[PDB]
Structure 1
Amino acid sequence: ENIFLVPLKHLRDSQFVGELLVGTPPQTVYPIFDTGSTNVWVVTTACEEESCKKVRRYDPNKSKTFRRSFIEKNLHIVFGSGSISGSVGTDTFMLGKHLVRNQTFGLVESESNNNGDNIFDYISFEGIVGLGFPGMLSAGNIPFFDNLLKQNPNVDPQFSFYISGKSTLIIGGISKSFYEGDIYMLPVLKESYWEVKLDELYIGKERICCDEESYVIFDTGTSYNTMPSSQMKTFLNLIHSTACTEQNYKDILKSYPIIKYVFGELIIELHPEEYMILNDDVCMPAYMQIDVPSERNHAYLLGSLSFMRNFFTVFVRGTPSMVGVARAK
């Protein structure tokens, strides 16, 4: 019981959903498990958009343990992918046979693009289980993950994502099934994200960072890696897209640069086959600009598609927090 698995299903686009049970008796939802945010969100019967009506919507009136929050707060969140709004409440959650009572969460009432048709019209969004820190907790006293640990005192305070039908969130421990070699540890900074100091960044022989304080954030909620907007053109000039097939892409990418993230004594090298994705016979880098609240201009995300596909990540919760990285098996 004390180390347990949450199998993740890869639905398109990317991100990866697991089974969460909410309310009494339990209603099932398939949220994404997001280290890049903190709030729990659940799509509800309050959302009357077609994008909500098409999924399994949580019905708070069917939950005996649901309590609408006393403070009637409307939360608006602008993600990089779209916007969600709704109100706040409390309920009992079940994750992987573990109970988490009196958990604050957002009840989705609305979903939109940030500008007509939006991402939610394409995907099957049912919510977010944020695994970030209290600095982006919009309502309530305690983040989900800290609450689960509080109410489950024999769980070790850690979780890890193994990406790629064999993706799984492992809570309380790790498995040698998922990684090779050693795990190196970096201290977490600030109060919002699984954020670490970045000392330098090279694209092949070119140093492109760092002269100010800079940071990497480990974000399972985003497929892509990122750079700050000022370095958008930097990256696009040094790493071109190019024609490729399934048959020749290894040869085409032999000429591409190694991207080196320098975290002090630890250097993570992303080889071309680890950061270039093949879509429509084009090799394109899995990098884009994305606004990071509270870390504009100096944050670099490491996402799921490039980074976690190749590197097993362990997230150790301070009881100071640490991130562990090792090569995926």
Structure 2
Amino acid sequence: GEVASVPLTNYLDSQYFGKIYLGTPPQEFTVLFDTGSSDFWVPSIYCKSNACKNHQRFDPRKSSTFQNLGKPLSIHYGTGSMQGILGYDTVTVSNIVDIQQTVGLSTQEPGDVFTYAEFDGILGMAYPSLASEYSIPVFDNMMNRHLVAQDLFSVYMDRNGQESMLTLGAIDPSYYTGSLHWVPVTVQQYWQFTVDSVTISGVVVACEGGCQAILDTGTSKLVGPSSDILNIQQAIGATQNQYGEFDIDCDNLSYMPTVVFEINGKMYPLTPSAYTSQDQGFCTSGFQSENHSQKWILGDVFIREYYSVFDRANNLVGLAKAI
């Protein structure tokens, strides 16, 4: 029973990664903590993908606590792909040593998604049900071994001089203002919960009747179904680009609306500053549509605004105003 603070590093608000150590002697890795997946992998010495030679590669041979599982790992995100071999070893996440933890050793990471990525591997934080066969999610090994004070992990996020933070076993109230509002997780796979509606001046632009959304730190934007996100891009002032995309006039924030996510009777506004990422002169929408549709993904755009707490104990998501 212990608590752990993982400083998260922020690259261009699109990737949040912290440091972790694998095996004995400990080998160091940066890993994006992803609440939208349940597999923990790191590059390994068996991987000869460019993404692998330009990132840190775990060497199981150098680790004595390493235990080969033998079972393949292959994961498809919405953005990226990795194939791996499964094994066991000791992961030190901060001050929590997570013994005999199933970790994927990447074999091939085709594509360029991880290649130009800041971090080496991903550490899924979703439910076990999302985890690959043979694979046990990291927080899950922590709970079963009772290494966390409470079966809760909390995320805070963003920028400069700077300090994003993942906390394990606890919640840091200094990262949020107001009170934490607990949203029940409906479907335990993703950190999925119901969003009552999406309003723009009390008007529902999207998410009519209610819709399902997942709190996903590994998603940079705020993804919603095509039609709905369209109606949002037009309801705000965005335009479609000239080499594909949606743009926002940076000088126009003051005149643009607040996009309020209602979750459990409580309002989660996203100001034009939150839903707008600026590249010095050029502002784009933090709203991304899904080629298809259905589930809304509340990414680092929402997470940056709302200190999120993932409670495995009670299958709650606590939401509060980020500091």
| TM-score, scaled relative to structure 2 | 0.89
Match of 2:49 in 1: 49
Cα deviation digits, residues 102-150 of structure 1 (max 9, x gap):
221221111123xxxx233322331111110012111226321021122
Which stretch of structure 1 is more off in the superposition, 88-97 or 227-236?
Answer: 227-236
> Is the 2:248–2:285 Cα contact (8 Å) retained in structure 1?
no
Pick one of 74, 87, 101 that aligns with 2:99: 101
2:110 matched to 1:112? Answer: yes
Match of 2:145 in 1: 151
Cα deviation digits, residues 70-107 of structure 1 (max 9, x gap):
4x33x332222221112211212111121212221221
**1:105–1:212: structure 2 CA closer, same or farther, 3 Å change rule?**
farther
> Is the 1:159–1:315 Cα contact (8 Å) retained in structure 2?
yes
Give the letter for the 1:216 counterpart.
A
Displacement, 1:280?
Answer: 4.5
> Is the 1:43–1:125 Cα contact (8 Å) retained in structure 2?
no
Give the letter for the 2:200 counterpart.
I
Cα deviation digits, residues 270-319 of structure 1 (max 9, x gap):
1211111112412221011347xxxx732111111x2122221111112x
Separation in structure 2 between the aligned mates of residue 64 and residue 139 of structure 1, nearest angstrom: 24
Give the letter for the 1:112 counterpart.
P
Give the letter for the 1:66 counterpart.
F
Match of 2:221 in 1: 224
Separation in structure 1 between the aligned mates of residue 60 and residue 308 of structure 2, nearest angstrom: 35
Pick one of 77, 80, 84 that aligns with 1:79: 77
How many residues align structurally?
A: 311
Q: Sequence identity, in percent?
A: 32
> Is the 1:181–1:327 Cα contact (8 Å) retained in structure 2?
yes
2:172 matched to 1:200? Answer: no
Displacement, 1:205?
Answer: 5.1
> Is the 2:248–2:276 Cα contact (8 Å) retained in structure 1?
no
Separation in structure 1 between the aligned mates of residue 194 and residue 228 of structure 2, nearest angstrom: 18
> Is the 1:213–1:298 Cα contact (8 Å) retained in structure 2?
no
Separation in structure 2 between the aligned mates of residue 84 and residue 290 of structure 1, nearest angstrom: 22
**1:87–1:213: structure 2 CA closer, same or farther, 3 Å change rule?**
farther
The DSSP-based 3-state class of the residue aligned with 1:253 is helix
> Is the 1:199–1:209 Cα contact (8 Å) retained in structure 2?
no
Q: CA RMSD in A?
A: 2.1
Cα deviation digits, residues 148-189 of structure 1 (max 9, x gap):
122235611111112122111111222232111111001112
Separation in structure 2 between the aligned mates of residue 225 and residue 154 of structure 1, nearest angstrom: 30
Displacement, 1:233?
Answer: 2.8
**1:290–1:22: structure 2 CA closer, same or farther, 3 Å change rule?**
farther
2:293 matched to 1:297? Answer: yes
Displacement, 1:234?
Answer: 2.4
Separation in structure 1 between the aligned mates of residue 46 and residue 23 of structure 2, nearest angstrom: 16
Which stretch of structure 1 is more off in the superposition, 88-97 or 39-48?
Answer: 88-97
Separation in structure 2 between the aligned mates of residue 264 and residue 8 of structure 1, nearest angstrom: 29
Match of 1:25 in 2: 25
Residues 112-191 of structure 1: pairs in structure 2 closer than 5 A: 112-113=110-111, 118-140=112-134, 142-153=136-147, 155-164=149-158, 165-191=162-188
Displacement, 1:268?
Answer: 1.0
> Is the 1:37–1:132 Cα contact (8 Å) retained in structure 2?
yes
Separation in structure 1 between the aligned mates of residue 44 and residue 302 of structure 2, nearest angstrom: 32
**1:46–1:80: structure 2 CA closer, same or farther, 3 Å change rule?**
same
Separation in structure 1 between the aligned mates of residue 56 and residue 265 of structure 2, nearest angstrom: 47
Give the letter for the 2:311 counterpart.
V
The DSSP-based 3-state class of the residue aligned with 1:237 is helix
Displacement, 1:16?
Answer: 1.5
Match of 2:243 in 1: none
Pick one of 233, 238, 262 that aligns with 1:236: 233
**1:214–1:103: structure 2 CA closer, same or farther, 3 Å change rule?**
same
**1:257–1:130: structure 2 CA closer, same or farther, 3 Å change rule?**
same
Cα deviation digits, residues 23-72 of structure 1 (max 9, x gap):
121111111111111010111111112221112210111111212214x3
Write 1 or 2 for the structure with the bigger share of strand: 2
**1:13–1:59: structure 2 CA closer, same or farther, 3 Å change rule?**
farther
Cα deviation digits, residues 240-264 of structure 1 (max 9, x gap):
03333xxxx4xx2122121121223
Separation in structure 2 between the aligned mates of residue 123 and residue 154 of structure 1, nearest angstrom: 29
Separation in structure 1 between the aligned mates of residue 142 and residue 264 of structure 2, nearest angstrom: 33
Give the letter for the 1:254 counterpart.
S
Give the letter for the 2:231 counterpart.
T
Separation in structure 2 between the aligned mates of residue 326 and residue 283 of structure 1, nearest angstrom: 26
> Is the 1:105–1:139 Cα contact (8 Å) retained in structure 2?
no
Residues 54-73 of structure 1: pairs in structure 2 closer than 5 A: 54-70=54-70, 72-73=71-72
Which stretch of structure 1 is more off in the superposition, 183-192 or 136-145?
Answer: 136-145
Match of 2:319 in 1: 325
